Amino acid sequence: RFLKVKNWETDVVLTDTLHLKSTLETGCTEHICMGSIMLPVRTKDQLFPLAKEFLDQYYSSIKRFGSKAHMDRLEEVNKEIESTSTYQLKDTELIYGAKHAWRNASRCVGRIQWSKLQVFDARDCTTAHGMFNYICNHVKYATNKGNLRSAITIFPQRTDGKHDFRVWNSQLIRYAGYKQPDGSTLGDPANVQFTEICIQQGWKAPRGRFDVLPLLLQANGNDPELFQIPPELVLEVPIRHPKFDWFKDLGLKWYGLPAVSNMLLEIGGLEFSACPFSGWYMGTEIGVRDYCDNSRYNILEEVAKKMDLDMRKTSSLWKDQALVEINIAVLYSFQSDKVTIVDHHSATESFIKHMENEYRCRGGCPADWVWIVPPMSGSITPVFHQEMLNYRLTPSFEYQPDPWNTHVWKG
Amino acid sequence: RFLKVKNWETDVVLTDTLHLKSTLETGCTEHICMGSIMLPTKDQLFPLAKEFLDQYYSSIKRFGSKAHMDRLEEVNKEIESTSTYQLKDTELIYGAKHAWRNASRCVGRIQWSKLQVFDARDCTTAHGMFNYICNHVKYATNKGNLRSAITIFPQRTDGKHDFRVWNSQLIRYAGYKQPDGSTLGDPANVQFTEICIQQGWKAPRGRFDVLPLLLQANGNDPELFQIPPELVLEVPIRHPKFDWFKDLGLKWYGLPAVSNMLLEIGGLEFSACPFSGWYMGTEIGVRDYCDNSRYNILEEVAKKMDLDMRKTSSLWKDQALVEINIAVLYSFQSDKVTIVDHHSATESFIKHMENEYRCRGGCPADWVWIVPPMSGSITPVFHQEMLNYRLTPSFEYQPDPWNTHVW
Ligand code: HEM
Ligand code: HEM
Ligand SMILES: Cc1cc(N)nc(COC[C@@H]2C[C@@H](OCc3cc(C)cc(N)n3)CN2)c1
Numbered sequence A: 001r002f003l004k005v006k007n008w009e010t011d012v013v014l015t016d017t018l019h020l021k022s023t024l025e026t027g028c029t030e031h032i033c034m035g036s037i038m039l040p041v042r043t044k045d046q047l048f049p050l051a052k053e054f055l056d057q058y059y060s061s062i063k064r065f066g067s068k069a070h071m072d073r074l075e076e077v078n079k080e081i082e083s084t085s086t087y088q089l090k091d092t093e094l095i096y097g098a099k100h101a102w103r104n105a106s107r108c109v110g111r112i113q114w115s116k117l118q119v120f121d122a123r124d125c126t127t128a129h130g131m132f133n134y135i136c137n138h139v140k141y142a143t144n145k146g147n148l149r150s151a152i153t154i155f156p157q158r159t160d161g162k163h164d165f166r167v168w169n170s171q172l173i174r175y176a177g178y179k180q181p182d183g184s185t186l187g188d189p190a191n192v193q194f195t196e197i198c199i200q201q202g203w204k205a206p207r208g209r210f211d212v213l214p215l216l217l218q219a220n221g222n223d224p225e226l227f228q229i230p231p232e233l234v235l236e237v238p239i240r241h242p243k244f245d246w247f248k249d250l251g252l253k254w255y256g257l258p259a260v261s262n263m264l265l266e267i268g269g270l271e272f273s274a275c276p277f278s279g280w281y282m283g284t285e286i287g288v289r290d291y292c293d294n295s296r297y298n299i300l301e302e303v304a305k306k307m308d309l310d311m312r313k314t315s316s317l318w319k320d321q322a323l324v325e326i327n328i329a330v331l332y333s334f335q336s337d338k339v340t341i342v343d344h345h346s347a348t349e350s351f352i353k354h355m356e357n358e359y360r361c362r363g364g365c366p367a368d369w370v371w372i373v374p375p376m377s378g379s380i381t382p383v384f385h386q387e388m389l390n391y392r393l394t395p396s397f398e399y400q401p402d403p404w405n406t407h408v409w410k411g
Numbered sequence B: 001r002f003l004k005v006k007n008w009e010t011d012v013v014l015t016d017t018l019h020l021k022s023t024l025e026t027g028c029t030e031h032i033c034m035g036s037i038m039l040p041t042k043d044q045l046f047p048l049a050k051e052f053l054d055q056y057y058s059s060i061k062r063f064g065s066k067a068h069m070d071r072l073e074e075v076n077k078e079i080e081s082t083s084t085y086q087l088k089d090t091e092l093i094y095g096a097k098h099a100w101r102n103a104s105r106c107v108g109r110i111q112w113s114k115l116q117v118f119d120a121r122d123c124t125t126a127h128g129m130f131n132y133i134c135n136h137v138k139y140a141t142n143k144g145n146l147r148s149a150i151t152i153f154p155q156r157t158d159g160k161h162d163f164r165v166w167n168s169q170l171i172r173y174a175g176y177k178q179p180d181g182s183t184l185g186d187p188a189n190v191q192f193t194e195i196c197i198q199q200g201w202k203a204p205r206g207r208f209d210v211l212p213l214l215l216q217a218n219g220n221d222p223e224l225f226q227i228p229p230e231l232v233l234e235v236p237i238r239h240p241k242f243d244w245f246k247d248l249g250l251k252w253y254g255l256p257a258v259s260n261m262l263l264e265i266g267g268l269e270f271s272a273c274p275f276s277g278w279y280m281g282t283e284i285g286v287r288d289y290c291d292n293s294r295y296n297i298l299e300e301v302a303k304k305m306d307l308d309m310r311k312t313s314s315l316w317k318d319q320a321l322v323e324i325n326i327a328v329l330y331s332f333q334s335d336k337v338t339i340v341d342h343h344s345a346t347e348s349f350i351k352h353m354e355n356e357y358r359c360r361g362g363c364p365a366d367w368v369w370i371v372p373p374m375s376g377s378i379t380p381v382f383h384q385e386m387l388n389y390r391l392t393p394s395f396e397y398q399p400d401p402w403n404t405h406v407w
């Protein structure tokens, strides 16, 4: 079967066949679309099919499908599963798998870059201190003094589900948030619960507005342990504006390295519960969401005040005006400091070129419109006008619940 | 089977039960989401009639009453004999209001119960259609104090006697492909303009020419009529700070009036049912003015602002966008023509959603359409999970008549 998507700006029509390979579910049915819903131990029997599906894809990609090497590898994995109840990936399969999880990530606008991913194999890791060391090396490699490089570090896979490796941080680098007795928040309200956990575990909180959180690291199902990332490894950018000299006195800064640490990587049925990955920022992630969400730093008012916009009625579009100036500031700042960043116009244009390429060479590109369209200036970006099909391919990145909700505390 | 939606800004969680009453299919499956796709006999009619009359009688708290059982009887009888039936005025009004209530793509539904319904089922000719439509335009416009209205022409019979307004909106601007290669006017309307010229319209060949109505009665060939110019309220666009903005020569019309959709009520199909509200400012300033395939004015504006257009990262597009949208709102407000900004409209929709969840058990909403085309995440709807599903009565897309009509 063939599904078509149309671009309503260019009238380019594309044909998807790749969707024939999805099997996981969307949340939607013939009666209800859940496209805007944020969140819509295995057995041997389920495992070998998943392994086989993956190895068939891997061997096809290297043009060795049905070779002796492919067949010997299937037999080898089959025997390993029946005997040990799991299997180990070869390094080449791990690299291919991690790259494909990114390629398959339907909410990711930056996927043009998918084939350029540095994979660090941390499956020999055994302790939280070992995890800390791997993560520092990742951060230093990825940061590359501002010339950012995409990377992923993969810790040992799930076994019985009682021995999981987890990074409790949602990102490797993030700022603390402190709920005050008066109900106000100091720092980032997104990270209050995690900050309280760090404090409880013994972190000495500086109690400022941009305090880089400590890593909380769990190895082999053990209780997690705290570590401070060496400050010299954490690249930060002070935010200033090209024309507005008072912008700097808002005291804003942000970190250069976006590094997701709380997702689960599935490759061939295996589950990598600690797999931190990092790329570089699109400016709106900081300028629109991190700074301007009401539930985050919430700076729109102070910026509009300083700009002397008419704030008595929403129809002056003062919020819209201040929003643009903040985003100019973020891009100007990163560029001035030679820290990699991409604007939402460039990133969405590259994404459309990536998407069209994927259609031609792969037969599709699953994409989640709700997430791909930037949170400002939506229809002046080409993705707004692009119909997309969202479906689930593996290898994949998945949400997993926060570990403080599920961890069995040892003592 | 019972579904939750969460607002990620306020943590408020609502429970949807209304989706179980959903009837038509979404386009999505368990394997694939089509949420971003623009367009994903007798024996059939009585179930549809019954479904509607049950909800109607429930709505006036008379469910299972003799008057309810009598009406079902009467309609059953009428379909049996005539192959169709006719709605009571009370039913027609209820159906139309509810079609708006059910429109998952409409942010303005807080207004749904204040809809003036003009019953034009007694209309028989295109000249009659023109009269009804001028009356709708004048009533809805109300000298700038806009009032929502719908005018309902006779229902489909055998499908060869359809009433249709050929225009996509009652008021729109012509588009002309030029020898030059460019497009003069609105590129959205090039094909319809040609059909108008072909059917005899003498086009002025300007940038903002109000199209004539092309009206089809009783499945007859469509006829042309010009809307009295004095009934078409238009707004010249100026900016509160940039005096040069008026020199761009921009204007828009006050009355957004959709005329190409089909109203389905209790299985009956009303193929000509033009309806109108008032504008949200972004519809004109972001989409009509800035879409690359519409008036595409960003470059010109940015050039007059003297912005650095060298690199996308200066955000010159974003800067010019905000200014254009400021000018749209200021112009409408200064001329006292009703308009809503996207902040006000989306705040109102959140309130409406909470009302509908509390009073009705849900509100079908299409996030892709509801979130405005600029400044998405600074409006509350961005952070609001929504469920999309199809309830009847409904407004539906139907194919353009020139593909379907046999001359
Ligand atoms: C190279 C530069 C990259 C850019 C500019 C980029 C851009 C983005 C943006 C803007 C989002 C949505 C984030 C949000 O709104 O919270 C996102 C999501 C995502 N990206 Fe990327 N990305 C990049 C690299 C990567 C890499 C290296 C990976 C994994 C190897 C990745 C995988 C993902 C995943 C799984 C999501 C969805 C996350 C979720 O559901 O919370 N991306 N990307
Ligand atoms: C009173 C003020 C109203 C406001 C502010 C408003 C707002 C909007 C907006 C902004 C859109 C999206 C339009 C687009 O992006 O092309 C829309 C769509 C829609 N509205 Fe409304 N609306 C109003 C009145 C009405 C009325 C009176 C009806 C019917 C009686 C209606 C039914 C619809 C329908 C069916 C759609 C989707 C049309 C389509 O799919 O193309 N609305 N509304
Ligand atoms: C509950 C829930 C599920 C789910 N899938 N996502 C969320 C919220 O998303 C948090 C976002 C995703 C992460 O950033 C995206 C990103 C990742 C990368 C690798 C690069 C980049 N520029 N941007 C951090 N914030 C919440």
Ligand SMILES: Cc1cc(N)nc(COC[C@@H]2C[C@@H](OCc3cc(C)cc(N)n3)CN2)c1
Residues within 6 Å of the ligand: B038, B039, B108, B169, B256, B257, B258, B275, B276, B277, B278, B279, B280, B283, B397
């Ligand atoms: C009643 C009303 C009020 C208001 N403020 N705005 C509107 C705007 O809707 C008018 C038209 C109808 C919409 O058409 C877009 C469209 C195109 C196609 C091909 C299909 C479809 N369902 N919808 C957008 N403009 C309508």
Ligand SMILES: C[C@H](O)[C@H](O)[C@H]1CNc2nc(N)[nH]c(=O)c2N1
Residues within 6 Å of the ligand: A035, A036, A037, A038, A370, A371, A372, B008, B382, B383, B384, B385, B386
């Ligand atoms: C409810 C809704 O799905 C939610 O607010 C989404 C919308 N789109 C998004 N898009 C991106 N890129 N990131 C997000 O966090 C969200 N949040």
Ligand SMILES: C[C@H](O)[C@H](O)[C@H]1CNc2nc(N)[nH]c(=O)c2N1
Residues within 6 Å of the ligand: A008, A384, A385, A386, A387, A388, B035, B036, B037, B038, B368, B369, B370
């Ligand atoms: C492909 C995509 O569905 C399309 O561009 C949509 C997105 N959201 C929209 N939203 C509104 N309100 N109006 C539109 O015309 C569109 N177009």
Ligand SMILES: [Zn+2]
Residues within 6 Å of the ligand: A028, A029, A032, A033, A034, A035, B028, B029, B032, B033, B034, B035
């Ligand atoms: Zn869907």
